[PDB]
Amino acid sequence: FEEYTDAFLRRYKDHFQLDVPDNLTLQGYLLGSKLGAKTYSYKRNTQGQHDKRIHKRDLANVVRRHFDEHSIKETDCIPQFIYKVKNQKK
Amino acid sequence: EVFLGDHPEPIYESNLNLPSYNHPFFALPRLEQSNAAEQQQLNEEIESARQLSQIALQRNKEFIRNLQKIRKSVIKANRIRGRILNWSREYL
Amino acid sequence: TIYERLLEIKQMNERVTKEINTRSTVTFAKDLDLLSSQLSEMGLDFVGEDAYKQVLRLSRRLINGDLEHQWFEESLRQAYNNKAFKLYTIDKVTQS
Amino acid sequence: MVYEATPFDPITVKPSDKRRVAYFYDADVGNYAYGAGHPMKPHRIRMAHSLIMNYGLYKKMEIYRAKPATKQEMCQFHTDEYIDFLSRVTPDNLEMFKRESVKFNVGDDCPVFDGLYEYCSISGGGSMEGAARLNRGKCDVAVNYAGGLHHAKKSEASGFCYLNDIVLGIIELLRYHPRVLYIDIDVHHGDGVEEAFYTTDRVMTCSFHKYGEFFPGTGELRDIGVGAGKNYAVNVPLRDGIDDATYRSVFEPVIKKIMEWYQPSAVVLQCGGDSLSGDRLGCFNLSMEGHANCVNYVKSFGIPMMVVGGGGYTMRNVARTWCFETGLLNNVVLDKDLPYNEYYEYYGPDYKLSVRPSNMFNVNTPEYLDKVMTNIFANLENT
Amino acid sequence: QGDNGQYARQVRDLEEERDLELVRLRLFEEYRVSRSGIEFQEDIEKAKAEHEKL
Amino acid sequence: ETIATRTFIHQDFHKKVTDLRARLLNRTTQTWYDINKERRDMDIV
Amino acid sequence: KTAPPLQSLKPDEVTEDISLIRELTGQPPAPFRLRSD
Amino acid sequence: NDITDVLEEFPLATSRYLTLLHEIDAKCVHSMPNLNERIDKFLKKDFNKDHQTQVRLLNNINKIYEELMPSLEEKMHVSSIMLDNLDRLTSRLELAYEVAIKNTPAMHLHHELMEKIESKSNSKSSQAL
Amino acid sequence: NISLNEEVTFFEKAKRYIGNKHLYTEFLKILNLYSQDILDLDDLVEKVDFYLGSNKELFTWFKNFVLDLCEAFGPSYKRLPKSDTFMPCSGRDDMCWEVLNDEWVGHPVWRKNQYEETLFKIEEERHEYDFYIESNLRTIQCLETIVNKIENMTENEKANFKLPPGLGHTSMTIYKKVIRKVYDKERGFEIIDALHEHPAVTAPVVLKRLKQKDEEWRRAQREWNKVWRELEQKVFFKSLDHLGLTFKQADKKLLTTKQLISEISSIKVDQT
Ligand SMILES: [Zn+2]
């Protein structure tokens, strides 16, 4: 499920209250070079900082595992899905 | 914006105050804005102005959005009338 | 025709000489050597002298064969912009 | 008689007035080639931007990058099928798109080149973001040199212009303004924007073009508008080799009258570079200072203005006039020296910030100017 | 006061974009400085070679 | 050129962050007033 | 008078590049077909 | 025919609400120039030379704003009424257009017979008098 | 209430068509993820396209659920036929229809010397060379950061790493043009596919090759810059002289004895 976007994964983590740090953006991932390690973002996002970020692949794998693990029951969700579809205009 | 993190005034190379670098190149831009008991009073007035201005901007933006929707409605009606009149004229 | 053609450049020689005097090449164009000194090689540049007193001298040099007819156009143009355009056929007009 | 020739006064700018300008530049704009033998050359935007960087103008101006326009945003004017084909077409599969290309007027005089959608989206995004920042009131001037291609119709791409971002910019300005005055300086008639806004009052599509044997074939004195847009199509057809003094004497009265009567709130000023001496197809003889006096006069009023690029089939002169206009927008006069840049060797043998007029037959007799001014004033008093 | 989670995340993404742009600028500047240097060295080489050949 | 484009990037980042903060505040306000509209228009019926 | 068109990479180098990348990645060698369309 | 009726109905409600809005603008129009002048004087670069002046200018701005909120909230209220009434009117208008355009029915035929009786009754009210 | 009947028939038809408990529960998990304001509508549609791709009507239901003959206004413009006035424009706001014109369309009513042509040819060649060089330089600038990242990343992630379309660049086509040109525009398909799929092993090679090509083309540009400079030395000024080329003909034609008699005879005739 790495084919998705950053917004979907961030909102998934927020909704399910998962304890996984937000994924690093593709540009943020490529930022981390030898000279790229001297920038503010990389020097403040690597060690000793609670705001540390991690790659998109691992977060995608974690979300895929949690999504497949999370079982579903049609009676609980299908009416909720119909209500949300008929409510989006409001 | 003057009372918040953003800078409403335009900032230039002089305003950014970036430190000189010789090939500090990635250094953050130091900035300055336009401007016990007494300092607490000043903070109280600053906070008061802050949230009252937020409320005022909120109200004005909501009013403008409402007027935008009303003008959309009026333009819709005018276009309908013009199109039907042109159709009638086209008939004869 | 000769009188009016000469007057059309005499009336603006006053400002043309000032423009020529105030001309200053940029420091970093001589390195590229695109500034062709052919006018400087033949002295056709108007710097340091009045424009009219050079244009009549060059007209005389053309009429007596001192200067080739081909170079006269550029010799006057690079100093006079293109406001002295009419008097390229000065030799034939004087001959007529 | 209305036209009255006057001597060209020196450039003067108010030092007390302060103007905010938000220059827009997408670094990837100048990397698409129309073809081997095509007059259109997007490199001029990059050379002009390099000039503004080197002149030191960045210390007194704001510059950003405009996000590319989305397909739905770009469809605010053009038809769905047109944009769909423009996206789907590539220089390598036109054999299966021959009928669509024939219908859409593309391929023969306007050919298909890779990155066409990227260029169109960049120009549209520049125009739309300029208009959006104009509405928000943060910047008084929103310079978008990338776009300005006003020859694009609703369903046809004629005159080397595939997308008309000026229409989208005017639309996003009209979302918060009742009346915006549009000024054209391109030699060709602005057929696209004119046709788009020919039946409306909320715009003032003023123009200064040339009438003769051309591709547009429009821009007569007769065309003034239909419906509520009657007498709201100001055209000033001209002829060969209009010089600086007479162009200024034509421009200043007309613009003064428009601002006194029409009273717009924002100006979408086209600044096409093909109205200069030494152009590839443009027949005018206007110098760069003449090309910038119009912009300075428009700026002197003190109202929000959106400057856009547009045509211009030469590179050096267009870049020079664009950087001079950008400097003049800051109440700063640029010196004649062109400081060294990567593309310095382009700028002719003079290497000075100036484009010099050529000797062309000034067919623009004063009688024609008087007649056209009288007609324009007569059709303008009705506003 | 900027404590919002979504606003903070967007600020972090924008700062990452800014820092990558600053890195790319430095890398490109160094590369084209090297390009200018090698061109200048080749120019000197050719000039000296033509001098000696003449 | 390096100084110019560095300042350009910093200006672009500042503009983007200001625009995004304003967008978020406006979206919060819009949702608040939409909620108030819905609450007012739900009691009428 | 007229400059020749800017040259592309010689075929003897494009074949080396494609073969090198195919062999290092694990792909089979270059097929003897031309996907002309 | 309903299109004609909604076209008549539009301007009346629009004008009632706009007159209300004009009244709200009237009751607070004398403080906008004062607020703008105070803001511009505050944003002057030669102003920070006395702290008490900054305090008093901030106090004046706060007082003006405290007086200015009520007009703004009344403006929101009247604009919301505008929006909902106009929404209803546009709903009626575009149902009318859709019905009139879908067919280039007996219920609306009956209304013609009901109105034909009224037209017949009113025409005979002059003959019989 | 009736609308629920057809929706439930749709759901049971989907259950019958899919014919797999695992696929159906995955699809319903996706639907629930949409229902929790997590999945975007377009993302939801494109995801369910995998399941409901082969049924046209079922997928349609789901997508639904979630120029002289004309009259002329003057000489320039003409009136569009009705069969063309309404054409698909899905981006229009409420005001995008009010001001923009639909029925009125434009319709057109219907000399250079040999030195401006040479100057324009010079400019065309200059622009061609500079355009190629600048495209290569931009691609090199992007691949420089790409390779600087590749060389600082562990072998464990080299194999599975993939570069998204765009390579982090704003333009999705600039990087394609240089590769097509350098690799003869035919075999470049494999190179670009490998770059998309295998960045760690293609980006360094392509970056080095592009650097070599940039150096070679800079050498060629330096070589031809002298020729362009020389050919622009002697043509720029005479290009601006439009009438001077025929000035000799004009002078020899305006002073002929026949013209001398004619310019007086015609003036006398006009005066009479
Ligand atoms: Zn043009």
Author numbering:
A (entry chain J): 104 to 193
B (entry chain M): 216 to 238, 287 to 298, 328 to 384
C (entry chain A): 1153 to 1248
D (entry chain B): 1 to 383
E (entry chain H): 56 to 109
F (entry chain G): 255 to 299
G (entry chain H): 291 to 327
H (entry chain L): 12 to 115, 129 to 153
Question: What's written in the study?
Answer:
Cryo-EM data were then acquired, processed, and the resulting map iteratively improved to 3.5 Å resolution. The cryo-EM structure of the Rpd3L complex reveals an overall architecture comprising two giant lobes attached to the stems of a two-stemmed cross-brace scaffold. Lobe I is formed largely by Rpd3, Sin3, and Sap30 and is wedged between the stems of the cross-brace. Lobe II is made up of Rxt3 and a second copy of Rpd3 and Sin3, but unlike Lobe I, engages only one of the stems. Stem I is made up of a heterodimeric, anti-parallel, two-stranded α-helical coiled-coil comprising Sds3 and Dep1. Stem II is comparatively shorter, formed by a heterodimeric, anti-parallel, four-stranded α-helical coiled-coil comprising Rxt2 and Pho23 oriented almost perpendicular to Stem I, completing the brace. Each lobe and stem together appear to form an independent structural unit. This bipartite organization takes the form of an asymmetric dimer characterized by Sin3 and Rpd3 engaging with each other extensively and almost identically in each unit of the dimer. Unexpectedly, the Rxt2 polypeptide chain snakes through many nooks and crannies in both lobes, engaging as many as six subunits and serving as a molecular glue while also stitching the two halves of the dimer together. Intriguingly, whereas the active site is readily accessible in Lobe I, the site in Lobe II is completely occluded by a segment of Rxt2. The active site tunnel is blocked near the entrance by Leu80 that mimics the conformation at both the main chain and side chain levels adopted by an Nε-acetyllysine substrate bound to an Rpd3 homologue.
The Rpd3L histone deacetylase (HDAC) complex is an ancient 12-subunit complex conserved in a broad range of eukaryotes that performs localized deacetylation at or near sites of recruitment by DNA-bound factors. Here we describe the cryo-EM structure of this prototypical HDAC complex that is characterized by as many as seven subunits performing scaffolding roles for the tight integration of the only catalytic subunit, Rpd3. The principal scaffolding protein, Sin3, along with Rpd3 and the histone chaperone, Ume1, are present in two copies, with each copy organized into separate lobes of an asymmetric dimeric molecular assembly. Rpd3 is the sole catalytic subunit in the Rpd3L complex.
